[PDB]
Amino acid sequence: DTKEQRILRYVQQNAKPGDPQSVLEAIDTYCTQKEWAMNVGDAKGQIMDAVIREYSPSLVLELGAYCGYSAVRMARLLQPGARLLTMEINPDCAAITQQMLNFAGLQDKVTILNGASQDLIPQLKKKYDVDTLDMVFLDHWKDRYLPDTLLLEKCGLLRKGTVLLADNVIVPGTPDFLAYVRGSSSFECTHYSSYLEYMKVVDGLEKAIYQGP
Ligand SMILES: O=c1c2cc(-c3ccc(F)cc3)cc(O)c2ncn1CCCCCn1ccc2cnccc21
Ligand SMILES: [Cl-]
Ligand SMILES: [Cl-]
Ligand SMILES: [Mg+2]
Numbered sequence: 001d002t003k004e005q006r007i008l009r010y011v012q013q014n015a016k017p018g019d020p021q022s023v024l025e026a027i028d029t030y031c032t033q034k035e036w037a038m039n040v041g042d043a044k045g046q047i048m049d050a051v052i053r054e055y056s057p058s059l060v061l062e063l064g065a066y067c068g069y070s071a072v073r074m075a076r077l078l079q080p081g082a083r084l085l086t087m088e089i090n091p092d093c094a095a096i097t098q099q100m101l102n103f104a105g106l107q108d109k110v111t112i113l114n115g116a117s118q119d120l121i122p123q124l125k126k127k128y129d130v131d132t133l134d135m136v137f138l139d140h141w142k143d144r145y146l147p148d149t150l151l152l153e154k155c156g157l158l159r160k161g162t163v164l165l166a167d168n169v170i171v172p173g174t175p176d177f178l179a180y181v182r183g184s185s186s187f188e189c190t191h192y193s194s195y196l197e198y199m200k201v202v203d204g205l206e207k208a209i210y211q212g213p
Contacts, residue, residue, distance in 0.1 A: 003035050004096050007067050010034075011103060018105035020076035027069050031198050039069035040139065040167055041197025047205055048137070048165065052077045055163055057134035061124075062086035063117050063148060064140035066093055068100030070167075074137065075106040084110045085128060087117050087140070117148050122155055132159040138166040138177075145177035153210075162210040169206045171196050181208040 001009075007030055015026040024045070031037050040048065052074055060078070065071055065088035075084050088094040094112050101107050113120045113128070117140060124130040136152065138145050145166060152158050169178055169191070181187040187208040196203040 002092070003037060004067050004093060006035065007031070007037060008096050008099055008103075011100065015103070017103055020072050020104045020106060023072050023100065023104045024069065027067070028198075036198050038066060039197055040073065041069075041195075043195045044167065044192075044197065044203065044205055045070075045073050047192045047194060048073060049077060051163070051165055051207060052135075055135060056082075057163070058082045059130065059133055060084045060135045060137065061133050061157075062137040062139065063144070064088065064138070065097040065112065066139075068097035068104075070137060070139060071097060071101060071110055072104045072106060075101070075109045076104070078109055082109065085113055085124075085130075086110060087113045087115070087120050089114075089116050089140075117144055118151065121148060121151050121157070124157060125155065130157065133157050133162055134159075135163040135165065138164065139168065142168065142172055142174045142177075145174045146180055149177065149181070149208075158210045160210065160212045164206075164208040164210065166206045166208070167203075169204050171201060171203045174206075178206060181206065186211050186213065 010030045011023055011026045015022040028042050065086040071086050094114050098112055101110050182189050190207045192205040194204050
């Protein structure tokens with residue numbers, strides 16, 4: 001088996017079914033004690049929780065699911081009837097993510113979109129019935145952060161106040177995205193310094209609130 005399968009099995013065997021917090025704790029325990037993995041982790045996760053609670057978004061798009069950690073983290077804090085769409089290019093990871101969400105009891109709040117962001121973003125309006133997004137969590141290929149932000153805008157998916165929250169802006173890093181949003185009058189930006197998941201290595205999140213054309 002794969003690392004990702006091992007993580008899922010550990011959750012199934014050490015967390016309580018239907019209890020998202022127990023699922024997060026199990027993942028973070030496994031990844032601290034047994035095998036590192038690229039989940040957002042608890043340090044940056046606490047910042048995400050604070051942001052989610054501030055905005056109470058109705059419709060969230062996540063770019064990059066992996067094993068479902070961040071999807072569980074966000075979905076557990078959504079209000080009744082609020083929804084998360086999460087895009088995952090790797091089909092084996094899509095399947096882990098769906099199983100993770102199922103175990104957590106969050107499957108009614110979350111939809112997986114299978115494919116690449118550059119192919120799926122232009123389908124959101126017509127196939128997934130999206131008007132505009134309230135929040136976007138970027139956690140996919142670093143070279144796609146900037147082009148997908150620009151694509152979201154082109155497709156009319158951003159509104160005044162849409163919150164972009166980006167993982168890994170320091171490590172591995174997203175220099176073009178950071179330079180762009182920080183230099184643009186169309187975004188209001190804030191950097192949240194933190195640590196790489198499971199590691200004593202500095203990383204951070206960037207929040208960039210869209211302000212219109
Ligand atoms: O690579 C990383 C990563 C690496 C490290 C990391 C740090 C330090 C290290 F030393 C090593 C790795 C730490 C992290 O937190 C990471 N988070 C996310 N990702 C992106 C994973 C692959 C996304 C593929 N993908 C998923 C949906 C989707 C849609 N369209 C296109 C592509 C798409
Ligand atoms: Cl994650
Ligand atoms: Cl952590
Ligand atoms: Mg990440």
